Amino acid sequence: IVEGSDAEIGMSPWQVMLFRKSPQELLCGASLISDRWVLTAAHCLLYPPWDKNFTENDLLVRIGKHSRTRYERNIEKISMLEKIYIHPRYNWRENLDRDIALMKLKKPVAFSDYIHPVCLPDRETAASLLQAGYKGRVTGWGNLKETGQPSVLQVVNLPIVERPVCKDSTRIRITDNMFCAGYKPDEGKRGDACEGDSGGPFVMKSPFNNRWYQMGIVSWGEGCDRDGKYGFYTHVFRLKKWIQKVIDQF
């Protein structure tokens, strides 16, 4: 996260770290959506242009974390993966359309002050909140600058951007399964996701019921915090029927 700040303790208790077993390293962010299911970006697990194709046994998920590098004894919980599910129409060839994946844990994780699931949006919450100018919150342990790394989880609040502005910022084909967020050059304020934040959540706090909803997944961007560029996020609600199908059948 570029131009963010240190998270408060327990501020994002649905935050998940995807952790490579060997070599031990951060792979991506992710989010907890129930005691057995973790949501992330498909490109965190499968990206053939970079020879990336992780299997269940390559990975762990670390939940309840704050420090990036420490083993947070008595606080974090480390879980093994039972199965990965990648969206069947994830488009890694062109533009990361449908950049979404689910990971089922081998055993349910115990909730705590530091470990708690985020809600997924319904149609009405998505319609009300996914409007240009409305701000969401992005969290992760990724790089602090494009070209360095944080001691603890970082957080930044960013406004959703009008779709024509998103499209006009890039040569990539933008789809209805994506939205973009970030400040414009003349808005003064700054902030973006960066390498390592991939797969983490873009959340919004509903003013109707005071619950946090995951509206986006950190998907891609052109540089980190570049003027005139925006971060792109997977549109969770648009892919929710697939989410439900996977969970209701596995």
């Binding site: 408060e8 959506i33 708690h116 809600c119 701000k135 609040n157 005071n210 946090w212 909803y213």
Partner: peptide, 28 residues
């Protein structure tokens, strides 16, 4: 799911975090 999105150290104790008000103020 029934309890989703309500943080133990914030909403469940009626404590606000330092920047959530920025989000609320954007929801016009």
């Amino acid at each position: 799911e029934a309890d989703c999105g309500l943080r133990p150290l914030f909403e469940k104790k009626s404590l606000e975090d330092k920047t959530e008000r920025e989000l609320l103020e954007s929801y016009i």
